[PDB]
Write a protein that binds this ligand. Structure first.
Ligand SMILES: [K+]
Ligand SMILES: [K+]
Ligand SMILES: [K+]
Ligand SMILES: [K+]
Ligand SMILES: [K+]
Ligand SMILES: [K+]
Ligand SMILES: [K+]
Ligand SMILES: [K+]
Ligand SMILES: [K+]
Ligand SMILES: [K+]
Ligand SMILES: [K+]
Ligand SMILES: [Mg+2]
Ligand SMILES: [Mg+2]
Ligand SMILES: [Mg+2]
Ligand SMILES: [Mg+2]
Ligand SMILES: [Mg+2]
Ligand SMILES: [Mg+2]
Ligand SMILES: [Mg+2]
Ligand SMILES: [Mg+2]
Ligand SMILES: [Mg+2]
Ligand SMILES: [Mg+2]
Ligand SMILES: [Mg+2]
Ligand SMILES: [Zn+2]
Lengths: 147, 174, 206, 38, 59
RNA sequence: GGCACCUCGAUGUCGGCUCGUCGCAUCCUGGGGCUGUAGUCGGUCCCAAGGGUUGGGCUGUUCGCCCAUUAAAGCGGCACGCGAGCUGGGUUCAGAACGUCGUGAGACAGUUCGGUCCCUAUCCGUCGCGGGCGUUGGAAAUUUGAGAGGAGCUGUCCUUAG
RNA sequence: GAUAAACGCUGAAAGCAUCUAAGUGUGAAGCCCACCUCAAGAUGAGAUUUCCCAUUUCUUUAAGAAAGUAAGACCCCUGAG
C-alpha cells in the first residue's frame, strides 16, 4: 500500500540533551551520542531526513581513555604538503582541546555526507560542567546503562 | 618475611592524622603528607601501626609493602630525619654553602651553584665534605644525587663527587 | 615601544670615530592612539595607532566617527601594537619618535616593493639551464616532479606575482632621532618603496 | 650497554629484570654485562 | 521498519531482538511493516504489543 | 636472477641539466652506554632524518682512479623520479673503413669516423590573479588565530689553561 | 614545555636487591612552542570601533513584491610607489 511513514523537515521537534562525559570511555560516549544525533532513538527515524536531537557534552576534559590511549593513541593529519604529516596524542588533546577529541570521535561515527555533516553541528562539547545553552532548557541524558 | 606485614612503631612522640587520603605524619623534624592508595587498610594502636591488604594478588602484594615502606619512611624522617654524605675528591675540588645555596668548584671553567628548597638544608662540615639533610627521603636522595651528578666519580683517579662510602670501581689505566 | 612612519629614502651618516654607515630615513609625524583594546572588551590587549593626517574629503563618516574619541583628524594608516603597557597609553595620546633612543635595537616591518609577474629564476633564485650546447632550456622552472603521484606536489615553485609582501627586518640599530623633524635614522636598509608605510618596533629578540 | 635479542646473565652477579617492558640484565660487578633486549 | 521498531521497543524497556522473540512466543504474527506503523502512529497499541511480548518472555 | 600477469591499432631507452621529494640500514652536527676510554684522538652499540652533505683532471659514461678541499663530502626509493621540461656524447637505421668470420651476399665472437629529438594543453595537478555569491539590516576600518607555510647548517680563533 | 636513548630518586612485588608497580626527577640539532609569513569560504563563515536609522507604494499577515533613498561604494577620468 506504500503507507510507511516518512518524516518531513521541520515537523519533528528536536530535543536538547546534556550528556556527562566524566569517566566514560571516549568511544562508548561517542557511539551513544552519535545515535542521538541521527535520531536512531526515535521511532520517526527517516534516513533521508534529519530527525535527531541536540546533544550538549559537558566535562569532556574528564572523558576516559582506557589502557595506554592517553599516550599511544595518535591523531594524524596531513596538510597535503610533502612531509606535511602532523600528529598529536589523544592524551594531549584531552588536556588542551577536549572538544576536538570528542568532536573527532563523534565525527567518525556519523555518515560522511551532507546530512551527517549537518547532524554533527547539533553537537556541542564543553570541557567542564557548565554550558551557555540554558536557553534551550536541555534535559539530562543518563547514559550509564546505554554504554 | 614481608614488608607490608611488618609493624611500625612511633619513637618519641610523633602523631599521625588520618583522612580518606593524604595521611599526615608530624613530629620534631617537621610535617609530612602523602596520598596513599585506598586498598591498604591501616591499624593504629597507641604506638604500633599495621597495614592490612584485602587479598594476596600480585597487585595487592606489591602495594602493601610500598605503603608500609612509604609510611615508615614518612616516620623516620619526621622522627630522626634523613641525610646523604658526599665526599668530593680532587686536587683542588672544594665546596662552600652560604645559606640555602651550595657553590661547588669541581674543575669546570665556571663554579656550580646548587639551591635547596624549604625541606632540605646543606651542612658542609668541611669544604671537601657535603651533607644533605632534610625530612623527606625522596627529596634528600634526589638532591643528594644532583650534587653527585654535577661531577660523578671517575674511574682512573677517583676524582669527582662520590657518596661517602659508596663503592667506586677504579681502572688501572696506563 | 612602537611607531608608524613613512619611508623617506636612504642616505649615509658619519659616526663618531669616522665610520660611514648607510641609514634609511623614516619620517614619523606623531602617531595618535585611537583605541585601546583590553581583555574585557576585545579578548586581547593592544593599542590602535593612527599615523599621517588625511584630508577630510578623503575620509568617511564611519572613519571620522572612529577618530572622534581621540580628537584628531582622519588618519591614513591605522595599525595595532601588541605587548605594551596599556595603562601607560590612552585614547588621544600622541606617540613621538623620541620614544626611541639612538642605539636602540628595533624590528622594522614594511611591504616589499612590487615586481609584478616574475619567472622562477628571479622569484625563487633558481638556476638557468645552459645557454648553448644545443640547449633549449634557459629560464624554465625545472621538472614539475616524479611520475608516480600522477600530479604535482604543492610548493612546486613557478612564475607568479613577486613582491608586495610584508617583510620584517630584525635587530636593526636606531642611529639618530631628530624629534623636531619627526625623523628616525635606521642603520641599513628596510623593505618598501619610498613613501610606503613603515612599522618600527623594539626588537622582539632583544 | 649491549643491545641484542639474546640477553643472558654472564656471571654470577648478573640480575635479569624488566623495566618499561624490556628484558634487561644489570651487573654490579662488570658494566660490560649491562644488557637490554633489542 | 526494524530500526523504527527498535527505537520504539527501547522506549518500552526492550530491545528489538527480544521483542520479536517475545512476540513469536506470544503467537503474534504482526509483521514489521505493521509494527513500525504502530510504533509511529499508534504508540499505545505498540505498548500493548510490547507488554504481551514481555509477558511471553517471562513465561 | 626466475616467471611472462598490464602494455607490441608503441608504456621513448644510458649519462648529464633543471626541479626536487621521500625512507633511515646516519656521512656531518646533537644526546647517550660500553671500551682493551689517562688526556688528545678513537673503536663499537644505542637515540636522532632538523638542517647540512665541495669544485676540478680523465672517460658518453654510471662507476672508479686522481688533484685540491670539507664539519661531512651518507646510502637508497620515487617507470634504475624528472625527454608533451632540456641535452643527445653512449646506445651499430641507412654511408664508410679496420680486425675477424664467411666461397659469397653479408656478419660481429669487436671496433672506427659521420648521421632529422614533432606536438598551439582540453581536463585534473601546480604557481599566481580576478569575478560571483555566501557569512541573516546596509556600510567603513581594525582585528583574534582553527589551520597552514617558511626558517632549522656549520667552521676557525681567543679565553678558561699549557 | 613534553620526550628518545640513557641516568636516576624513593620503592615493593621478592625482609635482600631493584629507575617502576604506585609515586617522582634529569635528559637531544629531534617533537610542541619560541622567530617569520599567510590565514574565518575556520559554510564552525569569529571579535572590536565607528557610520546610516526605520522611507513610499502595492499586496498582506507574506522572512511579501516594488520604489525613491541614507551611510557607503562604484562607473568614468588623471595617475603610480
Ligand atoms: K610494446
Ligand atoms: K634522492
Ligand atoms: K661513544
Ligand atoms: K637529518
Ligand atoms: K668531466
Ligand atoms: K670528457
Ligand atoms: K620506464
Ligand atoms: K626529446
Ligand atoms: K608524457
Ligand atoms: K581529466
Ligand atoms: K567572516
Ligand atoms: Mg649553476
Ligand atoms: Mg635558445
Ligand atoms: Mg592520486
Ligand atoms: Mg650471543
Ligand atoms: Mg601460463
Ligand atoms: Mg592506443
Ligand atoms: Mg635508527
Ligand atoms: Mg615526461
Ligand atoms: Mg675470406
Ligand atoms: Mg655481441
Ligand atoms: Mg659533421
Ligand atoms: Zn655480570
Amino acid at each position: 500500500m506504500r503507507t510507511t511513514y516518512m518524516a518531513k523537515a521541520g515537523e519533528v521537534e528536536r530535543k536538547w540533551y546534556v550528556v556527562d562525559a566524566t569517566d566514560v570511555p571516549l568511544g562508548r560516549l561517542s557511539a551513544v551520542v552519535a545515535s542521538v544525533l541521527r535520531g536512531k532513538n526515535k521511532p520517526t527515524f527517516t534516513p533521508h531526513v534529519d530527525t535527531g536531537d541536540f546533544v550538549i557534552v559537558i566535562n569532556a576534559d574528564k572523558v576516559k581513555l582506557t589502557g595506554k590511549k592517553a599516550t599511544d593513541k595518535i591523531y594524524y593529519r596531513h596538510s597535503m604538503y610533502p612531509g606535511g604529516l602532523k600528529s598529536v596524542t589523544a592524551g594531549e588533546l584531552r588536556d588542551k582541546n577536549s572538544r576536538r577529541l570528542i568532536e573527532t570521535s563523534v565525527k567518525g561515527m556519523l555518515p560522511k555526507n551532507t546530512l551527517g555533516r549537518k547532524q554533527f553541528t547539533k553537537l556541542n562539547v564543553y570541557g567542564g560542567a557548565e554550558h551557555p545553552h540554558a536557553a534551550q532548557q536541555p534535559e539530562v541524558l543518563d547514559i550509564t546503562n546505554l554504554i | 618475611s614481608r614488608i607490608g606485614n611488618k609493624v611500625v612503631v612511633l619513637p618519641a612522640g610523633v602523631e599521625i592524622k588520618q583522612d580518606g587520603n593524604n595521611i599526615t605524619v608530624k613530629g620534631p623534624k617537621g610535617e609530612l603528607t602523602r596520598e596513599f592508595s585506598s586498598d591498604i587498610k591501616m591499624n593504629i594502636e597507641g604506638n604500633e601501626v599495621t597495614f592490612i591488604r584485602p587479598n594476596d594478588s600480585k597487585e595487592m602484594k606489591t602495594i602493601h609493602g610500598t605503603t608500609r615502606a612509604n609510611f615508615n619512611n614518612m616516620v623516620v624522617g619526621v622522627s630522626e630525619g634523613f641525610q646523604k654524605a658526599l665526599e668530593l675528591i680532587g686536587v683542588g675540588y672544594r665546596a662552600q654553602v652560604q645559606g640555602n645555596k651550595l657553590t661547588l668548584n669541581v674543575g669546570y671553567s665556571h663554579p656550580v651553584e646548587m639551591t635547596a628548597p624549604e625541606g632540605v638544608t646543606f651542612e658542609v662540615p668541611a669544604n671537601t665534605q657535603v651533607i644533605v639533610k632534610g625530612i623527606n627521603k625522596e627529596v634528600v636522595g634526589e638532591l643528594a644525587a644532583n650534587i653527585r651528578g654535577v661531577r660523578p666519580p671517575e674511574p682512573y683517579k677517583g676524582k669527582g663527587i662520590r657518596y661517602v662510602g659508596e663503592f667506586v670501581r677504579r681502572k688501572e689505566g696506563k | 615601544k612602537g611607531i608608524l612612519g613613512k619611508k623617506v629614502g636612504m642616505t649615509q651618516i658619519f659616526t663618531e670615530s669616522g665610520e660611514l654607515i648607510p641609514v634609511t630615513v623614516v619620517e614619523a609625524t606623531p602617531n595618535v592612539v585611537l583605541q585601546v583594546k583590553t581583555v574585557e572588551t576585545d579578548g586581547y590587549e593592544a593599542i590602535q595607532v593612527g599615523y599621517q593626517d588625511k584630508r577630510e574629503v578623503l575620509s568617511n563618516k564611519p572613519a571620522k566617527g572612529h577618530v572622534a574619541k581621540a580628537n584628531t583628524a582622519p588618519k591614513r594608516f591605522i595599525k595595532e601594537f601588541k605587548n605594551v603597557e596599556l595603562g601607560e597609553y590612552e585614547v588621544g595620546k600622541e606617540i613621538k619618535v623620541d620614544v626611541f633612543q639612538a642605539g636602540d635595537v628595533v624590528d622594522v616591518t614594511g611591504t616589499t616593493k612590487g615586481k609584478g609577474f616574475q619567472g622562477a629564476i628571479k622569484r625563487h633564485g633558481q638556476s638557468r639551464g645552459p645557454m648553448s650546447h644545443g640547449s633549449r632550456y634557459h629560464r624554465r622552472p625545472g621538472s614539475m616532479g616524479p611520475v608516480a603521484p600522477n600530479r604535482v606536489f604543492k610548493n612546486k615553485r613557478l612564475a607568479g606575482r613577486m613582491g608586495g609582501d610584508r617583510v620584517t627586518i630584525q635587530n636593526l640599530e636606531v642611529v639618530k632621532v631628530d624629534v623636531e623633524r619627526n625623523v628616525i635614522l635606521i642603520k641599513g636598509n628596510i623593505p618598501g618603496a619610498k613613501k610606503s608605510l613603515i612599522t618600527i618596533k623594539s626588537a622582539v629578540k632583544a | 650497554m649491549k643491545v641484542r635479542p639474546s640477553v643472558k646473565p654472564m656471571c654470577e652477579h648478573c640480575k635479569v629484570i624488566r623495566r618499561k617492558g624490556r628484558v634487561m640484565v644489570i651487573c654490579p660487578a662488570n658494566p660490560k654485562h649491562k644488557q637490554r633486549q633489542g | 521498519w526494524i530500526a523504527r521498531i527498535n527505537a520504539a521497543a527501547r522506549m518500552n524497556g526492550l530491545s528489538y531482538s527480544k521483542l520479536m522473540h517475545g512476540l513469536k512466543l506470544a503467537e503474534i504474527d504482526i509483521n514489521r511493516k505493521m509494527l513500525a506503523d504502530l510504533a509511529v502512529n499508534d504508540a499505545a497499541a505498540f505498548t500493548a504489543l510490547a507488554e504481551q511480548a514481555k509477558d511471553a518472555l517471562s513465561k
